[PDB]
Amino acid sequence: VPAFLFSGSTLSSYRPNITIALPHYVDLPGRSNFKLMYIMGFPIDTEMEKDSEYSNKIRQESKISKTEGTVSYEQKITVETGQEKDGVKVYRVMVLEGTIAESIEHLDKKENEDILNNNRNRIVLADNTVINFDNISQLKEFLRRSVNIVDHDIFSSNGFEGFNPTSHFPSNPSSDYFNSTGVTFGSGVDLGQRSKQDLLNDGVPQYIADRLDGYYMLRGKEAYDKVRTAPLTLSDNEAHLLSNIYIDKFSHKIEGLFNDANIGLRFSDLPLRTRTALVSIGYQKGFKLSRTAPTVWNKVIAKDWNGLVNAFNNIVDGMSDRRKREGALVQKDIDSGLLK
Measure the CA–CA gap between 276 and 328, rounded to whole angstroms: 11
DSSP summary character for residue 57: P
Choose, by CB under 8 A, the member of 55, 322, 327, 330 that binds a second copy.
322
**Does residue number 168 form part of the binding site for a second copy (CB under 8 A)?**
yes
- # of chain residues touching a second copy (CB under 8 A): 21
- C-alpha span between 233 and 168 (Å, rounded): 9
Decide: 166 and 231 in contact? Cβ < 8 Å: yes
Pick the stretch among 13-21, 173-181, 253-261, 329-337 that binds a second copy (CB under 8 A). Answer: 173-181
Q: Which of 159, 162, 205, 307 binds a second copy (CB under 8 A)?
A: 162
Q: Which is nearer to a second copy, 22 or 316 (CB)?
A: 316
Stretch binding Mg ion (CB under 5 A), from 9-17, 129-137, 187-195, 323-331: 187-195
Among 81, 112, 148, 181, interactor with a second copy by CB under 8 A: 181
Q: Does 179 bind a second copy (CB under 8 A)?
A: yes
* Length in residues, the chain: 340
Q: Which of 200, 152, 160 lies closest to 282, judged by CA? A: 160
Considering CB distances under 5 to 8 angstroms, the limit depending on partner class, which of a second copy, Mg ion, none binds residue 318? Answer: a second copy
Residue 174 beta carbon to a second copy: minimum distance, rounded to whole angstroms: 4
86 Ramachandran zone, left/alpha/beta (phi>0; psi -120 to 50): left
DSSP-assigned letters across all residues of 106-133:
HHT-GGGHHHHHSSEEEEE-TTS-EEEE
CB of residue 93 vs Mg ion: minimum separation in angstroms? 45
Q: Is 228 in the site for a second copy (CB under 8 A)?
A: no
Q: Are 69 and 133 within 8 A, CB to CB?
A: no
Nearest to 338 by CA among 277, 256, 257: 277
Asked if 176 is part of the footprint of a second copy (rule: CB under 8 A), the reply reads yes
Q: Establish if 19 lies at the interface with a second copy (CB under 8 A).
A: no
Span from 57-65, 122-130, 166-174, 196-204 in contact with a second copy (CB under 8 A):
166-174
**CB within 8 Å of 20: residues ≥ 6 apart:** none
Nearest to 24 by CA among 36, 7, 11: 36
Contact partner at residue 54 from Mg ion, a second copy, none, CB < 5 to 8 Å by partner kind? none
Cis ω for the linkage preceding 33 (within 30 of 0): yes
Dist CA 82 CA 1 (whole Å): 8
187 in contact with a second copy (CB under 8 A): no
Nearest-approach distance from CB 195 to a second copy, in angstroms: 18
Which residues, other chains included, contact 54 with Cβ-Cβ below 8 Å and sequence gap of 6+?
25, 35, 37, 46
* Residue 174 within binding range of a second copy, rule CB under 8 A: yes
CB nearer a second copy, residue 170 or residue 205: 170
Task: List the one residue from 228, 321, 335, 340 that touches a second copy (CB under 8 A).
Answer: 321
Q: Looking at 69, 98, 188, 327, which residue binds Mg ion (CB under 5 A)? A: 188
Tell whether residue 320 is a contact of a second copy (CB under 8 A).
yes
Please state, in angstroms and as integers, the Cα–Cα distance from residue 88 to each residue in 36, 44, 57, 201, following that order: 15, 13, 10, 53
Residues that bind Mg ion (CB under 5 A): 188, 284
Residues that bind a second copy (CB under 8 A): 162, 164, 168-172, 174-177, 179-181, 284, 316, 318-322
